[PDB]
Design a protein around this ligand. Sequence first.
Ligand SMILES: */C=C\C(=O)Nc1ccc2ncn(-c3cncc(Nc4ccccc4)n3)c2c1
Length: 270
Amino acid sequence: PTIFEERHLKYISQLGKGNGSVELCRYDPLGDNTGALVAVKQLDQQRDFQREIQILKALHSDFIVKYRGVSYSLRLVMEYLPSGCLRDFLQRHRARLDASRLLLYSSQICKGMEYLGSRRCVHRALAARNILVESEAHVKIADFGLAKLLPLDKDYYVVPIFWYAPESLSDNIFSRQSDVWSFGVVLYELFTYCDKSCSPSAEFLRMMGSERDVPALSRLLELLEEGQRLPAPPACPAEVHELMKLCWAPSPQDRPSFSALGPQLDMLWS
Ligand SMILES: */C=C\C(=O)Nc1ccc2ncn(-c3cncc(Nc4ccccc4)n3)c2c1
């Protein structure tokens, strides 16, 4: 929880890039390569980094990536999770992993989302690509770039689409209930071991009979209105598929809470 002097941050590698980049650095004030490793995020967006840091300063959970401080143009310094993105990890260790492990990860993501809910924080971005793996036994939620704190008196706000709840698609509405819908897509992703051919984009594009890279918002809404949903992945226990279907109830108030999904996933693992 400190200001990291830029001169002491020794660049190791680029971890990711998007809309924005995350760099693996060694914080070496001594200058003898004994210092701890950190992940440094760097970028009209002064308002957005101000928004993101205010949220991250306030989160303290073993299931949410730890905010470590700042460095300087504002840079955000976070803990580094050595096993990287869940999407990469599941694809590389598929043969060595099992349904038990995916239930353990599902339970941990659900605990972090319960915590975010307790802070009236909407994550919005939740997807396997922003879940990070600390160790074989532990994952954490990352990417707070689109996160938002709800007002005290309003449980929603108005702002890829394959993780979004229908109200987000049709009315630009986001809430903790739309985060539950996205969590259902994450459960789907975990159970495919993040396989590219069965990704939410690949599967929804097949279901919609699309012959293009970019989906049509109107067609996805039509498919969802019909009651169509992502199928149960081959590796998927029937119990988990039922939980996904609940997260995907068309009305937000009819979706389960993370506090209700959580013990169920925990038990399936245990
Ligand atoms: C798959 C990319 C990757 O390996 N990324 C990554 C690995 C390890 C790690 N530790 C900490 N972070 C981190 C820290 N703060 C923010 C972010 N932001 C994002 C993570 C994942 C997707 C998008 C943004 N990551 C990483 C990141």
